Design an enzyme around this catalytic site. Sequence first.
Site, PDB file in Angstrom:
ATOM      1  N   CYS A 166       0.802  -1.213   0.000  1.00  0.00           N
ATOM      2  CA  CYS A 166       0.000   0.000   0.000  1.00  0.00           C
ATOM      3  C   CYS A 166       0.846   1.280   0.000  1.00  0.00           C
ATOM      4  O   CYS A 166       1.636   1.535   0.899  1.00  0.00           O
ATOM      5  CB  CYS A 166      -0.969   0.017   1.200  1.00  0.00           C
ATOM      6  SG  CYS A 166      -1.925   1.536   1.317  1.00  0.00           S
ATOM      7  N   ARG A 173       0.022   4.644   2.953  1.00  0.00           N
ATOM      8  CA  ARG A 173       0.157   4.423   4.397  1.00  0.00           C
ATOM      9  C   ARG A 173       0.531   5.649   5.249  1.00  0.00           C
ATOM     10  O   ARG A 173       0.540   5.564   6.475  1.00  0.00           O
ATOM     11  CB  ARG A 173       1.195   3.328   4.649  1.00  0.00           C
ATOM     12  CG  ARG A 173       0.701   1.937   4.323  1.00  0.00           C
ATOM     13  CD  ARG A 173       1.757   0.891   4.586  1.00  0.00           C
ATOM     14  NE  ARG A 173       2.648   0.717   3.436  1.00  0.00           N
ATOM     15  CZ  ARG A 173       3.813   0.068   3.483  1.00  0.00           C
ATOM     16  NH1 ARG A 173       4.223  -0.467   4.632  1.00  0.00           N
ATOM     17  NH2 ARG A 173       4.568  -0.045   2.379  1.00  0.00           N
TER      18      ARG A 173
HETATM   19  C1  HEM Z   1      -6.540   6.529   2.052  1.00  0.00           C
HETATM   20  C2  HEM Z   1      -5.976   6.413   0.854  1.00  0.00           C
HETATM   21  C3  HEM Z   1      -5.384   5.101   0.286  1.00  0.00           C
HETATM   22  C4  HEM Z   1      -4.701   5.078  -0.856  1.00  0.00           C
HETATM   23  C5  HEM Z   1      -4.398   6.305  -1.741  1.00  0.00           C
HETATM   24  C6  HEM Z   1      -4.288   3.716  -1.110  1.00  0.00           C
HETATM   25  C7  HEM Z   1      -3.567   3.308  -2.195  1.00  0.00           C
HETATM   26  C8  HEM Z   1      -3.338   2.004  -2.536  1.00  0.00           C
HETATM   27  C9  HEM Z   1      -3.005   1.523  -3.850  1.00  0.00           C
HETATM   28  C10 HEM Z   1      -2.858   2.400  -5.116  1.00  0.00           C
HETATM   29  C11 HEM Z   1      -2.855   0.199  -3.763  1.00  0.00           C
HETATM   30  C12 HEM Z   1      -2.520  -0.722  -4.946  1.00  0.00           C
HETATM   31  C13 HEM Z   1      -3.784  -1.517  -5.265  1.00  0.00           C
HETATM   32  C14 HEM Z   1      -3.877  -1.988  -6.697  1.00  0.00           C
HETATM   33  O1  HEM Z   1      -3.132  -1.505  -7.600  1.00  0.00           O
HETATM   34  O2  HEM Z   1      -4.742  -2.859  -6.950  1.00  0.00           O
HETATM   35  C15 HEM Z   1      -3.091  -0.204  -2.390  1.00  0.00           C
HETATM   36  C16 HEM Z   1      -3.030  -1.477  -1.861  1.00  0.00           C
HETATM   37  C17 HEM Z   1      -3.400  -1.850  -0.586  1.00  0.00           C
HETATM   38  N1  HEM Z   1      -3.861  -0.996   0.420  1.00  0.00           N
HETATM   39 FE1  HEM Z   1      -3.966   1.036   0.327  1.00  0.00          FE
HETATM   40  N2  HEM Z   1      -4.732   2.909  -0.084  1.00  0.00           N
HETATM   41  C18 HEM Z   1      -5.431   3.731   0.802  1.00  0.00           C
HETATM   42  C19 HEM Z   1      -6.058   3.298   1.952  1.00  0.00           C
HETATM   43  C20 HEM Z   1      -5.918   2.062   2.549  1.00  0.00           C
HETATM   44  C21 HEM Z   1      -6.492   1.613   3.813  1.00  0.00           C
HETATM   45  C22 HEM Z   1      -7.411   2.482   4.700  1.00  0.00           C
HETATM   46  C23 HEM Z   1      -6.100   0.345   4.015  1.00  0.00           C
HETATM   47  C24 HEM Z   1      -6.364  -0.630   5.175  1.00  0.00           C
HETATM   48  C25 HEM Z   1      -6.841  -0.229   6.359  1.00  0.00           C
HETATM   49  C26 HEM Z   1      -5.266  -0.032   2.900  1.00  0.00           C
HETATM   50  C27 HEM Z   1      -4.645  -1.239   2.753  1.00  0.00           C
HETATM   51  C28 HEM Z   1      -4.144  -1.718   1.576  1.00  0.00           C
HETATM   52  C29 HEM Z   1      -3.856  -3.108   1.374  1.00  0.00           C
HETATM   53  C30 HEM Z   1      -4.016  -4.223   2.422  1.00  0.00           C
HETATM   54  C31 HEM Z   1      -3.350  -3.203  -0.060  1.00  0.00           C
HETATM   55  C32 HEM Z   1      -2.907  -4.486  -0.769  1.00  0.00           C
HETATM   56  C33 HEM Z   1      -4.083  -4.959  -1.618  1.00  0.00           C
HETATM   57  C34 HEM Z   1      -3.795  -6.337  -2.159  1.00  0.00           C
HETATM   58  O3  HEM Z   1      -2.783  -6.966  -1.735  1.00  0.00           O
HETATM   59  O4  HEM Z   1      -4.590  -6.802  -3.018  1.00  0.00           O
HETATM   60  N3  HEM Z   1      -5.171   1.030   2.027  1.00  0.00           N
HETATM   61  N4  HEM Z   1      -3.385   0.932  -1.675  1.00  0.00           N
END
Ligand code: HEM
Lengths: 409, 416
Positions: free
Chosen positions: B114, B117
């Site tokens: 992610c 973070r």
């Molecule tokens: C608030 C703004 C946030 C942004 C801008 C963001 C951005 C991203 C992006 C661009 C990815 C790549 C996903 C992809 O290309 O399919 C990602 C993955 C991920 N994010 Fe964040 N995210 C945010 C919030 C969160 C929150 C609130 C959580 C958990 C509490 C989180 C947990 C994760 C996890 C666990 C992944 C891995 C997904 C996977 O393995 O399939 N994110 N995030």
Amino acid sequence: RFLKVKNWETEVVLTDTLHLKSTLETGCTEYICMGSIMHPSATKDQLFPLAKEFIDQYYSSIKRFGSKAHMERLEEVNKEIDTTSTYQLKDTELIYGAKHAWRNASRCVGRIQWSKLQVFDARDCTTAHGMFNYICNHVKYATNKGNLRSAITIFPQRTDGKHDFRVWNSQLIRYAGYKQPDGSTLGDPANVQFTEICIQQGWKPPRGRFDVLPLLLQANGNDPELFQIPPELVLEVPIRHPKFEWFKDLGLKWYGLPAVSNMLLEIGGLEFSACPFSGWYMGTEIGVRDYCDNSRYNILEEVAKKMNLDMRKTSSLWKDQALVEINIAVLYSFQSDKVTIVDHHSATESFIKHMENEYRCRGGCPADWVWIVPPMSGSITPVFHQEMLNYRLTPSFEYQPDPWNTHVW
Amino acid sequence: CPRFLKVKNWETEVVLTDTLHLKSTLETGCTEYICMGSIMHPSPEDVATKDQLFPLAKEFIDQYYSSIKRFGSKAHMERLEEVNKEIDTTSTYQLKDTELIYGAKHAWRNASRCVGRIQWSKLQVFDARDCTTAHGMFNYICNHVKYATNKGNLRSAITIFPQRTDGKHDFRVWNSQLIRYAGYKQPDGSTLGDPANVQFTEICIQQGWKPPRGRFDVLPLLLQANGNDPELFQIPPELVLEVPIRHPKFEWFKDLGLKWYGLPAVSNMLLEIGGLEFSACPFSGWYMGTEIGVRDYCDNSRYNILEEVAKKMNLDMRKTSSLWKDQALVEINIAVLYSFQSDKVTIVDHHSATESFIKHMENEYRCRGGCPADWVWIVPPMSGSITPVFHQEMLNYRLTPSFEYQPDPWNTHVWK
Ligand code: HEM
Ligand code: HEM
Ligand SMILES: Cc1cc(CCNCc2ccc3c(C)cc(N)nc3c2)ccc1C#N
Ligand SMILES: Cc1cc(CCNCc2ccc3c(C)cc(N)nc3c2)ccc1C#N
Ligand SMILES: C[C@H](O)[C@H](O)[C@H]1CNc2nc(N)[nH]c(=O)c2N1
Ligand SMILES: C[C@H](O)[C@H](O)[C@H]1CNc2nc(N)[nH]c(=O)c2N1
Ligand SMILES: [Zn+2]
């Protein structure tokens, strides 16, 4: 166990067995992955197994494993490592060795070409002058009037560590980099140090942007010597743009022949510290990395200005627009001057084809996703969606320390 | 093993020193002889055992009290003996509200894939551990969506349903995201809508959904409570914030008829805290433009619009070396950001986002001695090297608490 890799766009699944034959370490552990670290992580008794392994591998390739020749060639190699503390490769082995170092290069998207490699044996070289001569022949042959050809020139193997052959250039052809009174930089910042080492050695520098650097050749562990590449052997391309008539004015040009000269070739336990090799360019290496990196020529702002782009917020993707234009220019230019070049769509398609071939005939293909995915338009090329296994096969191209850190003049 | 590990940024020569990797828990899939960094998931309905559970719970409690500067306190030891007894007599245990909020924030903080973070500490946690029915789930989920969406000023949140027990009473959201568009395979062989969701769409229709059969139909929620068959609920349409896609320059871009939803909310991952498994834990943030503009819209196995956009841009499409695909990609991603910003729906471009993450990562190294990141995922799908993360060395490793993958529930579910 057998491992499977999947393409997520086509759902094609290949099975990798080749990885079972690797023996060198990658730098990762069960608990940590280092796939984005640039550089992670002999004696006679060390040498013979390494030697034995490579010979077994060689005769296996020509389908004469366990043969008379094979038995005898092994006898000859051990006896030699006793009596001389080293050994010498046959011509055939040398050619086989260099082609498979390319084939095993996990970071090279161009390996579909690996077996069309011109191999220049220069193991009889003894002087920097001899080196300069072998190198001019390489450049002339590889450039080939614009129809470029893949080549490597191989100087004597390392002996005791103190009689080592080194090309001190990182590439045979590079542009000079000068640090201004400003604190600014003229030309290529990547080469500011090397350019200063050449000046200290006697090179009188044009102090312009795209000044071709001299060669710095070290033979048999002696001080390096300066040599001017005959200008008629250095093919260059003036960068222009098919639609933007003002793009001429930027004043950009690049050289045709990419020739890495600072890596180390390891075959059968032997170390070739001087083995410059060359192919041709994928456009992005120039148009994205050399021209648009911040630590390099850094032209994005200048170009996006001339395009009259709004540059005040990042979310107008002005950098992204200017990037695609610069790379259109590079590709248009090389193509117009009939100089060999490849775009990243075609290159990455070819590598996927190459992967299939290698899984079919060899049971695998080591690949570094970090390096294979182009530095622009990643996910609209097929390699983005392709799972790859990375692992270390020998023969191989290895990094080695800069010469100026070890050499005592 | 080495206590210290160096990572370098090759653009700025900044060197950082990682000690946190020493608290790595699970396998990466890599060995000393092979790296699996580009493998998407490097690999029974039964549960953790008493003896397996104490050390997982102890490790997490110690970690928690160390966080609040009360390590070794009487409160610490009282919590340990309390949890120990709970496990010994009921083979499981319950997290306090404070531990659950701690645990959730830290699972985000540990998510190596992610890029967002830097926001990890601001996360609204909704405790739904009292839920018992699918209707209850639908209620909890509607409140989540409404709060998170916030009329376009999105706020990140997570709703946590009851933990796993014997593995025959799992709570599961069957949707992969709370909000997605349907895909419909034609007899033609073509696909209407979003091809990525064709399987889940066929399950909904089989369960009883009456599909509108259009390009952008919001899927029903399919919700399973306490091991029971799942149930369909329609999300109230006024809770689904959507953005039509237009372009600042090309007036014809609206003619493409594109739109996307504002709230990315993932609902199929498992959250693991102190050895407990929360199989239903939808969390949401806000979009980075490339997610929609590049992957959703231009992936060949998705909406695959690159050709059509190219055509209207009047681009030479006979040779790849015209880079027509690249020109159109950028313009598509411009329109997307232009549209969200105009409708005051929160969104972040890949330049801002990666720059922020670099800063976040550096802070994490100084205050925490590390920050696991997955380079292959952190770097955006377009314009990679002109963003700072491209040049940044990263170490990847798995810290707990963590978000994990889990099998699709239809493959597993024993139907009542
Ligand atoms: C608030 C703004 C946030 C942004 C801008 C963001 C951005 C991203 C992006 C661009 C990815 C790549 C996903 C992809 O290309 O399919 C990602 C993955 C991920 N994010 Fe964040 N995210 C945010 C919030 C969160 C929150 C609130 C959580 C958990 C509490 C989180 C947990 C994760 C996890 C666990 C992944 C891995 C997904 C996977 O393995 O399939 N994110 N995030
Ligand atoms: C024939 C056309 C070729 C193409 C299009 C090509 C393409 C590329 C590209 C784009 C890279 C990444 C370079 C970077 O971004 O720094 C690369 C790396 C590499 N190539 Fe190839 N290459 C070609 C020929 C060759 C040849 C002839 C050899 C050796 C005989 C070779 C061996 C390597 C090696 C060892 C690397 C990794 C460099 C490193 O780790 O620093 N390539 N190639
Ligand atoms: C240590 C280091 C090493 C490198 C190696 C760069 N290699 C570039 C290269 C090397 C070989 C090529 C070849 C053989 C062909 C081709 N078209 N392009 C090629 C490009 C780059 C940056 C750093 C740094 N910092
Ligand atoms: C197996 C698989 C899994 C996934 C999961 C993708 N998860 C995307 C995601 C997950 C969480 C996000 C969050 C929390 C915020 C945000 N802006 N974007 C987010 C995007 C995607 C493709 C495949 C495939 N194939
Ligand atoms: C940190 C990272 O390893 C480094 O920036 C790499 C990333 N991928 C690359 N990929 C290619 N083709 N060439 C490079 O120089 C790099 N640099
Ligand atoms: C093969 C490769 O692991 C896979 O296609 C990955 C590459 N990087 C990614 N990065 C992000 N953010 N999202 C993705 O879906 C992917 N896909
Ligand atoms: Zn790895």
